[PDB]
Structures are given as C-alpha cells and as structure tokens.
Model the fold of this input.
Amino acid sequence: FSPVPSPEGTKETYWETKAPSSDVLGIGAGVSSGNFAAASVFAALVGGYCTGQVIPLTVEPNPLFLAGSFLLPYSWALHVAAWIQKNNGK
Amino acid sequence: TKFPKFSQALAQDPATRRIWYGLATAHDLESHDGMTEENLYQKIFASHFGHLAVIFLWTSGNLFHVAWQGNFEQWVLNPLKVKPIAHAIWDPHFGQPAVKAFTKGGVSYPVNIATSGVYHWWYTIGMRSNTDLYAGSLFLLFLAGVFLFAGWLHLQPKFRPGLSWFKNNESRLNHHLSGLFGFSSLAWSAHLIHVAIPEARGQHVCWDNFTKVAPHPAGLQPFFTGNWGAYAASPDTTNHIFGTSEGAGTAILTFLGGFHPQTQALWLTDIAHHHLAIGVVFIFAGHMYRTNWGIGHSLKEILDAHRPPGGRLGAGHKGIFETLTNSLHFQLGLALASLGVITSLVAQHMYALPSYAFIAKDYVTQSALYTHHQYIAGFLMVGAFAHGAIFFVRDYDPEQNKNNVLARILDHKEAIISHLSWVSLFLGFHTLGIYVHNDVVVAFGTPEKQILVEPVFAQWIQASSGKALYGFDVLLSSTNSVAANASSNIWLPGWLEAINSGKNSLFLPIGPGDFLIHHAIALALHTTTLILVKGALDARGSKLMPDKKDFGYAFPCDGPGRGGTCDISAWDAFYLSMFWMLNTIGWVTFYWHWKHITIWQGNAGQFNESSTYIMGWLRDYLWLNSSPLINGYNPFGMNSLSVWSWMFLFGHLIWATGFMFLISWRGYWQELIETLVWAHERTPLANLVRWKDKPVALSIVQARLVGLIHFTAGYIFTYAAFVIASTTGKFG
Amino acid sequence: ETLNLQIPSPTFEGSTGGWLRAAEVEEKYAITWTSPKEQVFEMPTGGAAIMRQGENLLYLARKEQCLALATQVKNSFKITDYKVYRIFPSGEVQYLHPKDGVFPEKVNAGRVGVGNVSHSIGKNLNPAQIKFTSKSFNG
Amino acid sequence: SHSVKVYDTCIGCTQCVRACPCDVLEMVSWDGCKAGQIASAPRTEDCIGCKRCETACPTDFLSVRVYLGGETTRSMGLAY
Amino acid sequence: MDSNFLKYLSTAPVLFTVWLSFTASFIIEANRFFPDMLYFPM
Amino acid sequence: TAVKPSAQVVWPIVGQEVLNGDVGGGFQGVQVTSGFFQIWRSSGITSEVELYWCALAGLIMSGLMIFAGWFHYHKAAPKLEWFQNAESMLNHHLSGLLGLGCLSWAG
Amino acid sequence: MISDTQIFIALILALVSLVLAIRLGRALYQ
Amino acid sequence: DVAGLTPCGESKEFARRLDGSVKKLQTRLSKYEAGTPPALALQKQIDKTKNRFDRYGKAGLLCGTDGLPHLITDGRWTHSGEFVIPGLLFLYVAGWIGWVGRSYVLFARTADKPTEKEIIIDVPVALSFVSTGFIWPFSAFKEFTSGNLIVPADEITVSPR
Ligand code: CLA
Ligand code: CLA
Ligand code: CLA
Ligand code: CLA
Ligand code: CLA
Ligand code: CLA
Ligand SMILES: CC1=CCCC(C)(C)[C@H]1/C=C/C(C)=C/C=C/C(C)=C/C=C/C=C(C)/C=C/C=C(C)/C=C/C1=C(C)CCCC1(C)C
Ligand SMILES: CC1=CCCC(C)(C)[C@H]1/C=C/C(C)=C/C=C/C(C)=C/C=C/C=C(C)/C=C/C=C(C)/C=C/C1=C(C)CCCC1(C)C
Ligand code: SF4
Ligand code: SF4
Ligand code: SF4
Done:
C-alpha cells in the first residue's frame, strides 16, 4: 500500500528451476559444489565426533567439542548448498 | 452531531445508534474518515505507548496496594500460613457482620485475599519489605510517565516516524530479538544472580550494596577464564530454608532440575541459568537480519526462495513479505496466535513447573492463575482467527498473492473446512457417545460395562520423560538408556525425583477420564477452529454471498432473500466461535480444577472413578463443590465467601441477560420502543423533556455483540466465583 | 400540480399509530387519491378508515406508510390515481410519487440511470485494492 | 443513506421496482438486455435497506445490490 | 397389493422408521442373547 | 398408603431392568405419577378384570372415532351451513356434552 | 510500613502520570 | 501388566465390584418369597451380573485401581479385540452404508425425476444396492482407480475465492 523497504543489496530469489540460483547462498554464491560437498562431509564427521565425545555431559565439558558439535546441523545446510551448486554447474 | 469525529456517517445519524457505534468503532483507526497510512501507523504507535503505560500503572497499583494495605512483611515471615492481602475494602454498603467477616490476613481492616500470586512472585524475585514493593510501584509510575511522554512525543511533527521506519522489518526483528527478548532475559539473569539468588539465601542486596557485594565468592574471574563450571559449584543444599542463610550454597547457575525441596518450586539458579541460556540464544538470533553493515538476511530473499521444487505449494511464499508488512491484520493475527499459544504454555507450564516459592501450596492461586491464563489464551486465539478474517476482507489482494500459500489455502478452502467439519463430527459423535454409554451403563448399575480407554500414548510420553508409574521402561523411565545416560550427570536426578514423586503436578497420573476429556478438548479446539476457519476462508465470499468482501467484516445479513442470510458475515463466525471458545476453556478449566482438587484432597481416585461419565462431573464437581460457595451467605449469617457467593449469582444473571439479546431480535424491540416514544410524547409533564437522539432498538450486529459480552462476562464471573470460592472454602 | 391543502380526508376515528412530533418538526408525508366509492380501507398506522367518494387526503409519518396505502388502494380498490408528497415543516410541498407522472415500473423517456454499473458484480474490486485510496470498488 | 447499485446483468424484469416499498428504483431505457430497460436508483435517500429488491431479483447474482451505509431518519424507518 | 399403498410405504419417513426400527430390533436382539459385549472376544 | 403406584414394567435388555424398582405389593415396575390408580379407586373399579373392560371400551371408542373421521370426511361430509350453527352447537355442548356428561357421571 | 509522606510522593507521581495521560489522549484524539 | 494395569481376573477391586454388585441384588431379593415373579426376576439379574464378571475376568481385559476394565488401543495385538477388530467390523459396515448410499444417489440422478427417488425410494433397486455393499472395499477401490469415485476439481462448484 506504501513501498515496503528491503535492505540494500536485496535481489530476486524466486525460482522455478531445478535449483535456485547461487545468489540464495549469499556470501557462499561463489563456492564450488565440490567445496560444499567436502565441507559438508567434513562438518558431518567432525560435528558427529565432537557431539559424540560429550554425549554424557559433565559440569566440565570441553568447550571446543561443544562448539565443534554445532557442525552437524551446519552440515545439513552445507549439503543443500552442495546440491544447489552442482545443479548450477559450479 | 459531532461525537464520532472520525466518522461523518455516524455523526449525522439522528438516533442513539450514533453513540453506540462511535464507541464501538473508536479503535478501528483504518476505517476513520480521511485516514492515511502515515497517520494510521503513528496513532497505533502512540496508543501502543498508552497501553504500555496502562500495564505499568496497573502493576504499580498492585505493588502500591500491597505495600500499603497488604501483609507482605507478615506473609514473607511465614508464607505457608499467612493469606496474602490484595487490598483493603472500604465499602459503605457493608454491614458490621461483613466488616468482621473480611478482617482476615492478620490485620485490623476488611481485605480481599489475593489470588493473583503476586506475593509469591515478589517473594521469589527478591522483595522482602514494603519499602521495596513501594519502590517498585514508584519506578513503574515513573516508567508509565516516561511512556506517556514518549507517546505524546512521537506524535510531534519532528518526532513522527515515517512509514519507512514502521516497515523496517529487519531492524525491528534484530532489536526485538537481541534487545527486547535477549538482552532483557540476560538482564533478568543478572537480577536473579545479583539480587534474587542472594536474597533467597539471606543476604540482602539492594542498590545500596550491589556493586560492593559479589554474587560469587570467586567473582567474574571464573567467567573470564572459561572456568564456567565454577559457577555451578556448591549448589543450594536440600536443607535450605528459603530466604535464609542455612542450607544455602554459593552457586548462581545450575541445571539441577526438579524442585527446591522446601518451596516446591524450580531452583532459582536453574531459572537464572535458563534466562542466561535463552538470552544468549535470542541475542544471537537478533543478528540474523541485514540492517546497515552488509551482513545478515533479507526477509524478502528468504521468503521468495522458499518454494519447493516439486511445485506442491505453487508459487510458495512469493509476495507473502509484502502482504504481511502491508497488512496490520495479518501481523495482529500472527501475533495473537503466537501469543495465545504462549499464554496456554504459561498456564500449562506454571502449574506443572512452578517457579515461585511456596506457590503450588496456594491452591486458590494455582486455580485462579491457570483459569485466568487459559481464558486469556482462548480470547487471544479466537482474536487471531478474527483478525485473519479481517485480513482477508480488508488487506488481502488476490492479484498480489497469485498462487501463493495464501491463494492456494483459499483455493482448497472447502477441503479445509469440510475436513474440519469431519474431524469435529468424528470426535463429537464418539466422545459424546462413549460418555453417554458410560452414563447409561453406570445408571443401569453396571459401571464395569463402561468403555474406559487408557491414555497409553500420553502415558508413554510421561514414561519417556521418566514416570515409572506405568512401567513403560521407555527412554528416561528405563535406567539403562542412551537418553537416560546422557542426562544423568546434569538434570535427570532432580527431574526423576520430581516426576516420580506424587506431591507435584508434574506429569499428573492420567487414566480413562483424562482420555475422554482430552478428546472432548480436541472436539472443542477443532470445532472452534472450524467456525473461525470457516469465517476466515469464507470472509471474502461464498456461494450464498459471492461479493461478501464488498460489505466488509461486520454487517448484519444480506436480508431474507436467497433463503435467509442471518449470521453470514465473518464477524458472525467470530461471534459463534466465541461460545465455542468459552465452552472449550470451560472444559479445560473444569478438568484442571476437578483433577487438582481431587489430588489436593488425597482423593485422586474420586476423579478417576467419576470423570468417565457426565453425572460424575455434575454431582461430584459442580454440585459437591458448590456448597461452600452458595453458603457464603444464608439466613444463618455470612462469611468472607459471600462476595464470591454474590458474584456467582451475578454471573448467572449477566449470562442469562445475554440470552435476551441473543434469542430475541430487533423487530420486536423496535416495535416496543415506538410505543414508548408515543407514550413519552403523549404524557403530560413528561413531554416537556425531549430526547436529542431518537431512541432506536440496538442494531443486529450490536445486539449480537451485547449478548456475546453479557454471555461471556457471565461465564467469566460465574466460573471465577466458583473456582475461587470452592477452592478457598475447601482448601484442597 | 401542487397539493391542494383543502382536499377532504378519509373518515378515521383516530388512532395512536399516527404521526408524532417529528412530523411537525422534520417532515410529513401526504397521499391523495380519487375513489369511485365510499369504501372502507385499512390504515397503515392502525385500524380501518373510510375513503370518501371523490378525492381523499392523508397525513402519514413515513413514505413507506404512504406507499403501503398506495398498494392497498391499487390491489383491492384498483385506484391508480395516487400522488405521494413530502411536506416540509417550512410548508414546502415536494411531489414524490409517481415522480414523472409514470410509474417507476414503466419505462419513460428522459429518465437517466443512476447507480448503474457497467460490469457484473463479480468484477468489483477487492477491498485491499481500494484501501488507502479514494478509488471506488465498482471498478 | 444506503447505496443501491444496478449491474449490467439486469434483464429488465421490473420485479425489483415493484418490490421497492419506498419508490427508490425506476426503469430507464437500456439496449443491453432484451427487454430494452434497466433498473435505476435515483432515490436511494428513501431506501430503508429492506432488500426486497434483492429478493425479487431473478438473476443468479442480484443485479440490484443494496449496500447499507449511513443511517438517516428516512433510512432508519423512523416515524418519529 | 395396491401400487399406491406400496408407493406410500416406499416414502422416506416410512422406510426410515421401518429400517431404523429393524436396525434397533436386531441390536436389541443381539444384546439380548449375547449381552455385555465390551470387546470382540479373542 | 404403603404401595407405590406403578403401571409400567421394563424389559430386561441392557441392564435397564434396574428401572423395575421395588414399588411394593410383591411387584417391580416403574413408579407412575399420573394419578390413574386414585381415579380408578374413585370410580370404584376394585378389580383388574374391570380395567380390562375399560381398556376394551377405550379401544372400541378409538375405533369408532377413527371410523367417524373417515366417514365424515369421505362418505358424509357436512356442508358449511351445518358448521355455522353456533347456537345449535352451544345448546348441544352445554346441555348434551357437559350436562348429560355431568348427569351421567353423577349417576 | 509506608508513610503518609511516601503515599503522597506516589500520588504526586501518579498526578504527573495523569497529566501525561491527558496530554497523550489529546494528542491521539488530535 | 500393560500401563501398570492388572488383569481383571486377579485384581481384588474387580472382585469387590462383583461382590458388591451381587450384594445389592441379594438385598433386593431378601424381601421377596422364593417362587414369586419379582424374586425370579431378581435372581436372573444376579445370574447375568455373575456371568458378566466371570466372562470379563477370563477375557484378558486389564482392570485399573478402580476395578473396572480398561481398554488398550495403541495397536497391540494382544488387545486387538477391544478396538482394532471392533473397528474393522465398524469400517466394513460403515463403508457398506456409504457405498450403498452413493450407488443409490448415482442411480437416482439417472431417473426421470431424480428428487422423487430420494423421498420415495425405489425399494427393489435400493435393495439391489444394499446387497452390493458386501464387497465395497474392492468395488470402491476399483471405482476410485477407474476415475469414477473422484470428480476433477474443475467439475465442482466453488465460491469465487
Ligand atoms: C348432544 C349432542 C352432542 C354431543 C354429545 C356432542 C359431542 C361432541 N361434539 Mg358436537 N355437535 C352437536 C351435538 C353434539 N356434540 C351438534 C348438534 C352439532 C352441529 C351444530 C355439533 C357440531 C360439532 C363440531 C363441528 C364439532 C363437535 C365436536 C364434539 C366433540 C368435542 C370433543 C370432546 O369433548 O369429546 C370428548 C367427549 C366425549 C363424550 C366423547 C364421546 C363421543 C360421543 C360422540 C359422545 C356421545 C355418545 C352418545 C351420545 C352417548 C350415549 C350414551 C349411552 C351410553 C346411554 C364431542 C364428541 C368437535 C369434535 O371434536 O369433533 C369430533 C367438533 O369439531 N361437534
Ligand atoms: C533493543 C531495541 C528495542 C527494544 C528494547 C524495543 C522495545 C519495544 N518496541 Mg521496538 N523497535 C526497535 C527497537 C527496540 N524496540 C527498532 C529499532 C524499531 C524500528 C525498526 C522498532 C519499532 C517498533 C514499533 C513500530 C513498535 C515497537 C514496539 C515496542 C514495544 C513492544 C510492546 C511491549 O511491551 O512488548 C514487550 C515484549 C516483551 C517484554 C517480550 C515478550 C515476552 C514473550 C511474549 C513471552 C515471555 C514471557 C516471560 C516469562 C515474561 C514473564 C513476565 C513476568 C510476569 C513473569 C517494546 C517496548 C511497539 C510498541 O508498543 O510501541 C511502543 C510498536 O508498535 N517497536
Ligand atoms: C450441548 C450443546 C451443544 C451440542 C451438542 C452441539 C453440537 C454441535 N455443534 Mg453446536 N452450539 C451450541 C451448543 C451445542 N452444539 C451453542 C450453544 C452454540 C452457540 C451458538 C453452538 C454453535 C455452533 C457452531 C457455530 C457450530 C457448532 C457445531 C456443532 C457440532 C460440533 C460437534 C460435531 O461436529 O459433531 C458432534 C455431533 C453431535 C454432538 C450430535 C449428537 C448426535 C445426535 C444426538 C444423535 C442422536 C440421534 C437420536 C435418535 C435423535 C432422536 C430424535 C428423536 C426426535 C427421534 C455439533 C452438531 C459445528 C458444526 O456443525 O460442525 C460440523 C459448528 O459449525 N455449534
Ligand atoms: C481424529 C480423531 C482424533 C483426535 C483429534 C485425537 C486427539 C487426541 N488424542 Mg486420540 N484417539 C483417536 C482419535 C483421535 N484422537 C482414536 C481413534 C484412538 C484409538 C481409540 C485414539 C486413542 C488415543 C489414546 C490412547 C490417547 C489419545 C490422545 C490424544 C491427544 C494427543 C494426540 C494423540 O495421541 O493423538 C492420537 C492420534 C491418533 C490415534 C490418530 C488419529 C487419526 C485417525 C484419523 C483417527 C482415526 C483412526 C481410525 C478411526 C482407527 C483405525 C482403524 C483401526 C480399527 C484398524 C489428543 C487429544 C492421548 C491423550 O492425551 O489422552 C490423554 C492418548 O494417550 N488418543
Ligand atoms: C396434553 C393433554 C393432556 C394430558 C395428557 C392430560 C393428562 C392427564 N390429565 Mg389433564 N387436562 C388437560 C390436558 C391434558 N391432561 C386440559 C387441557 C384440561 C383442562 C380441561 C385438563 C383437566 C384435567 C382434569 C380436571 C383432570 C385431568 C386428569 C388427567 C390425568 C388422567 C387422564 C384422564 O383419564 O383424565 C380423566 C379426567 C378425569 C377423570 C376428570 C375430568 C374432569 C374434567 C373437568 C372433565 C371436563 C371434560 C370437558 C369435555 C372439558 C371441556 C372443556 C371446557 C372448557 C368446555 C392425566 C395426568 C385428572 C387427574 O389429574 O387425575 C389425577 C383430572 O381430574 N385433566
Ligand atoms: C450414504 C450416503 C452418504 C455418503 C456416502 C456420504 C459421504 C460423506 N459424507 Mg455424509 N451425509 C449424508 C449421507 C452420506 N454422506 C446424509 C444423509 C447427511 C445428513 C445427515 C450427511 C451429512 C454429512 C455431514 C454433516 C458431513 C458429511 C461428510 C461426509 C464425507 C465424509 C464421510 C463421512 O464421515 O460421512 C459422515 C456421515 C455423516 C456425518 C452422516 C451419516 C448419515 C447417514 C448415516 C447416511 C444416510 C444413509 C442413506 C439414507 C442411505 C440411503 C440409501 C438407500 C436408499 C439404498 C463424505 C463425502 C463430512 C464431510 O464433509 O467431511 C469430508 C461432514 O462433515 N456428511
Ligand atoms: C484509556 C486512556 C485514554 C486515552 C488514551 C490513553 C491516554 C493512552 C489512555 C491512558 C489512560 C491513563 C494512562 C490514565 C492514567 C490515569 C492516572 C495516572 C490518574 C492519576 C490520578 C492521581 C491523582 C488524581 C492524584 C492526585 C494527588 C494530589 C492532588 C496530591 C496533591 C498534594 C498532596 C496532598 C501532597 C503534596 C502536595 C499536594 C500537591 C498538595
Ligand atoms: C485465519 C488466518 C487467516 C490468514 C492470516 C492468519 C492470521 C495467519 C491466519 C491465522 C492463523 C492462525 C490463528 C493460526 C494458528 C496457528 C497455530 C496455533 C499453530 C500452532 C502451532 C504449534 C506447533 C506447530 C507446535 C509444534 C510443537 C512441536 C513441533 C513439538 C515438538 C516436540 C518437542 C520439540 C518437545 C517434545 C517432543 C516433540 C513432540 C517432538
Ligand atoms: S432475520 Fe434479521 S438477520 Fe436474519 S435476515 Fe432477516 S434481518 Fe438479516
Ligand atoms: S429485478 Fe434484478 S433484473 Fe429484474 S429488473 Fe430489478 S434488477 Fe434488473
Ligand atoms: S432496499 Fe427496500 S427500499 Fe431500498 S431499494 Fe431495495 S427495496 Fe427499495
């Protein structure tokens, strides 16, 4: 009803193709699909290891294993980005 | 002729309808004459500051009246025996028996005993004396003044925010998540760690000493070394007497779980660690959106890109960004649905996990707080669907929303509504049929024949959280489990103690009566949703009235043609679902209250045997617990439950008076009023006095609203009188 | 054309259903018609009156009251000679019905269509389109 | 006053005008329909909003459409 | 038998009352000979 | 003064035979409150045989009224000038119906 | 316990809040 | 046993239910002479009460703390006679009624006057249809797949929105 503002640099992300354009990856638009797929497997293994090593949680957990355990959900978004980049020819 | 200055159509009405409609349309700023969008958002902003101030004046009033007239300092000495005082009574209609009957609380004047729980909340958060309750009342009066001045200030020409400011979604979300949600939760951890934790342990900490009194003996050195577990060391002992130094630990952040053994409330170090965790989480979440420095997300980009490639959602969320931002009704509906779910979470989690010291032994307070917040929940949820209907009528543009999630919801509106009709009918037929089966068989002297279905799925959920009553041996209930082993070193020992002990409302035992009532609540939630969803989806049109959008949200009917179009507006489905909201919160609060009063006696089996048929609900809950309430006055005297005894009848009257507006309709009343107009004009000594506004009968929509208000007010006042007086009179 | 104030009125024994102070301070309606007979009709405001043979004059508080008598006089006694007037307290007499000498149900030249919309009703604009703009919902 | 509209789906059946108790509607010449006539509303100030015209309308969606609006002494049906 | 009396017995209320009385009658008879069937016996 | 009136017995079907309560007199049935027992004692019936004869008299009257309705609609239906005899109808309903009704009942 | 002077301070601050409420209500009303 | 319940055959509360239910009837039987019609009626009621409790005890039902049978309806096969098997009997009869009524409304649409067939039912044809319901799952699934159950979305009247 009035012009709705968006932050500067907002671009069009609506897609009907096989994969969205790489611009939906934001800062990760130029990363290769191999680099996401390898980062995804690396993040899944190190995140799963770091998660697994502190499953009995103590009052003294290792802070590096806690922070490294966040790589498991991050790996999900990484392999989705790997799929998007392979289907954009990157 | 000038009262609705925002409406020339009402200001030229010569009838009494002008006063009513000007009063009822006053806050619908979008419909006011010559309303721009700038002025709409700026008046909503200033009136939101007025609501902020009203809330602060209400809280300052509760604090002032307890500091002045309450027995807070007597109550904090002995919180399980003293009854909290809300405010004093000065009523020149009282008799001397009434004055004597209300002189409880250990004071020399008549008083109302508080059911709001504010004593337990102020005790738990640090307040000890009347001076600090009063200081809180003063500070809230200052804050109310600050927000009233802010409301006036943001109406001044240089300080008027633009529409570009009001629709900056990313900056508002960043600040409300990281500042309003996250930093104030972090600041609330600071209040607990710095004030509430030391004063729960006997050590007074105020503004006079809080910069020279360390919350921890080590003191901000373990935090700045990564030795964070030193803040959990030496927790409060199980011998701790709340408010005192005996049994006290030094920890300020724990994850003990369960309940403080004396106060039977959550550990305050658990609550301080909760708000620290949830604070950091919300602060991190408030860095999500791009504002001025090139990092973050654009909400437009996120919504546009979330269209599944399978095409099952159509265009997905393309154009939903604009619709939400431009539509204040879509935002209100999201806000109210979200808020309604939370105040339902508030009601469910505050009775099962109480945070306040010595509450959950204040059975009247627990009943009043649960009932209060569930009724607020039903109102907010119904209003969310109401403003979704108002969104569809007023703010929804189909061309701007082509093949979206919103268009495709309207495209299958009949599949949604007919399947809600099915599930409502399904549940209603069977739940009522099983209840009637049980009633008929128990009546015929055969209780064994009753169809009693165990709530196994919910019992499995209880067992999965560690309840050992049902012998499921699932997850936490099984000692040798991955889930059990994981939490063993942290929260499981306390939680298992809390859940397995039968002294608390945590995962209360569930049986066949619980199953039947849950299915009744499912029928009620589905039926209220059916009416509300039918109203929202058919708001813009139907086969009966295709151009319903052109008439608005609240119109009486389209006349007697096409078979009859009474209650055809989307407002009228709000109206009809308001009864179903009242009925469902009735079923919820009746269930909660009956299950709890039976547990509080030590007679939970009385609910277990009588809740499976409806005469058990009638005789053993309504009739059995009415007796302290309806004997609040009698020909042999009166006691302090007389006020609830009078309010209970008052609720029955208002409720029944609502029936007059809902059953009897306009044409009868306009024909009465025209004979009264004749009589006034023909009566000598009385025709010297003339009305300025022609007396008319109430409108069709107005009378539906008046009957709904009377019905609802009677519902609330009747149940509030019952839930408070039956629990007070019984104490159990 | 103008209302002849001297037209005799039908024989009515009076009623409480007649007009009130708003007729003498806001507006009054009058209906005249010619009857071939001395016949009883029913008042819109109450009981029965007798219309006189020749010309009759009535004073009602509503235009629907006038048009209700007009239909009773046209369906039961076949009078098509009814003229409905709105009389202001100022004394101005406003002729109303039939407005141009021909009944509204019959076409007449020189009638300009008011309220006519060039499209069908399903082509009305949605309220969101017409929100915060003066543009009308009929296209 | 109320606002009364006539849409071009009007077949000129004259029924809404006959239904009108308040002489709001009348017939004007129109070449759009076979009857050579369309309803018109030059007297919506007398419209009480009874919607009898809508009932008499034989079109699938009433060509005559009453939209209840500002109330007056005339549109409220007040004999006082 | 008369065709108009048979067409009357084919009317919706007669068939509804007869069919639901027959339905009620075999529920009653099944609960007479085999009462208290809370479960399918197995 | 001790036996409670009961003229309705239920069948034992779904446990509903609990409604055959102990009303007294070696009897189980639903207690009836229409006051028929007091009417019959006022009439002087003093026997169930005479109640069977009254049931047959009611059955014969029910057959005669359904016959009379059929006869007076389909065989011999009175004309309007018959029904518009308010003087004759009042003479007969005062004298014949109410008057011989009271006279025969008093007898 | 609360002094009469303390109650009077609360009444002063609530009067200031009343005046600011009047000023906001007049501004919102225009 | 399941959900902390006890089998009804060894629960003491079911046994005291049976004993109390028989004592209520025996004290009603204690006010009648042996051969009288009320005493005979009351004794048959006692026999029915004992048969009900005897059958329930040996049925594998689980009783609560209240001594009343409880139904386990989570899907387990040791308790399928309380909901899963009675439910299958219901769905067969309900789908029978639905298939039979649907077949009759489709017949009645192809009539000379379709609405007389719904207030004056063609009883021989409707009885042909009530006989059709015994194989409704196959008849209805073949109907579904052959494009004769579901009509397309563009053949259904909908509101403008
Ligand atoms: C003295 C003669 C006589 C008697 C007894 C009656 C009796 C009755 N008339 Mg009336 N009627 C009469 C003359 C009479 N009518 C005449 C002359 C006219 C013409 C103007 C009408 C026109 C008339 C109309 C238009 C209607 C009646 C109706 C009725 C019935 C009223 C309902 C009621 O209370 O019945 C219950 C009381 C009873 C006593 C039931 C008994 C039924 C029989 C007919 C009574 C007489 C039996 C016999 C004479 C007794 C013999 C005694 C013997 C054992 C020694 C009632 C049966 C109304 C009605 O219900 O229609 C059926 C009705 O609509 N009557
Ligand atoms: C850190 C910065 C910041 C902060 C703190 C706020 C704070 C606020 N803004 Mg926002 N705002 C900001 C920046 C900020 N703003 C920016 C940058 C913009 C421009 C882009 C805006 C634009 C804006 C608009 C346009 C509006 C606001 C509004 C509001 C007020 C919300 C109303 C309210 O009381 O909610 C309070 C909410 C909470 C305290 C959190 C809710 C807690 C959830 C619901 C559940 C938690 C339950 C918890 C247990 C509480 C228990 C309590 C106790 C009894 C147990 C609130 C005071 C609105 C208003 O009222 O105007 C005055 C309004 O209209 N703001
Ligand atoms: C006890 C009171 C009561 C009851 C039972 C109902 C029942 C129902 N309401 Mg209503 N309603 C009520 C009060 C009540 N309402 C009030 C006070 C209001 C406020 C105005 C509303 C407003 C309202 C709205 C606005 C809506 C409902 C809906 C519903 C349905 C919801 C349950 C359902 O879908 O299937 C449950 C079905 C039943 C409970 C019916 C009972 C089954 C019957 C009794 C079988 C008995 C057969 C028996 C042989 C009959 C004997 C008759 C004899 C003459 C031979 C159902 C028909 C909704 C609806 O229709 O959704 C589909 C809906 O849209 N109600
Ligand atoms: C669509 C109808 C419906 C709805 C809305 C609910 C809703 C609810 N049920 Mg109920 N329930 C239903 C049907 C339904 N149930 C049926 C048919 C059974 C079997 C008797 C149960 C058995 C049951 C138990 C044992 C428990 C609940 C509980 C609950 C609550 C929590 C969620 C849950 O477990 O869902 C259950 C959801 C389902 C079982 C799936 C329902 C979806 C289908 C369409 C239902 C129809 C299935 C069909 C009729 C039977 C299959 C055929 C079979 C004979 C082969 C909630 C109130 C719990 C609770 O809170 O009680 C206190 C609980 O412990 N439900
Ligand atoms: C729905 C209709 C209805 C039903 C089911 C009943 C049912 C009953 N009535 Mg009631 N009754 C009704 C309407 C009804 N009444 C009306 C409308 C009246 C006013 C005339 C009466 C006056 C009435 C009386 C006076 C008596 C009953 C009695 C009875 C009971 C025994 C039935 C019987 O044999 O009566 C038999 C009736 C008698 C044995 C006495 C009849 C005496 C009256 C005065 C006879 C008048 C007959 C005459 C034709 C009336 C003409 C009307 C007149 C204004 C012209 C039973 C509870 C009796 C009772 O309660 O006993 C416990 C009883 O004494 N009824
Ligand atoms: C046998 C005919 C028949 C069939 C196949 C259906 C089919 C359907 N109905 Mg039902 N319906 C019917 C008759 C029928 N209807 C009648 C007569 C009524 C009026 C009471 C309704 C009222 C009704 C409502 C109110 C609702 C449905 C719904 C539904 C749908 C969900 C299935 C369901 O749960 O049924 C539910 C069935 C009922 C609630 C009523 C059952 C009525 C009886 C038992 C059937 C009548 C038998 C009929 C006389 C057979 C005569 C044929 C004979 C001459 C051979 C489905 C499209 C629901 C829906 O839209 O969800 C998607 C829904 O909300 N129907
Ligand atoms: C709904 C509503 C409407 C419009 C919109 C809205 C604004 C946003 C909203 C807000 C409504 C709001 C926020 C309403 C707020 C209403 C308030 C805060 C009313 C407060 C009243 C206090 C009084 C009268 C105290 C007076 C004390 C005195 C005279 C003491 C004096 C003195 C004593 C003895 C001692 C000291 C010396 C003296 C000076 C002599
Ligand atoms: C009508 C209308 C028109 C258009 C506009 C409009 C306003 C938007 C609209 C209104 C719509 C309205 C009013 C909508 C109302 C919508 C509501 C009330 C939605 C409720 C959602 C709750 C959810 C998804 C709970 C999820 C819980 C989960 C997943 C728990 C998971 C679990 C956890 C974590 C812990 C336990 C274990 C398990 C169980 C695994
Ligand atoms: S009854 Fe009242 S509401 Fe229903 S149609 Fe006639 S006017 Fe509109
Ligand atoms: S009724 Fe409908 S169609 Fe007939 S004339 Fe009036 S408007 Fe045109
Ligand atoms: S509403 Fe009544 S008055 Fe207004 S036009 Fe239609 S008919 Fe004539």
Q: What stands out?
A: The helical segments of chain A are 33-52, 63-69, 71-86.
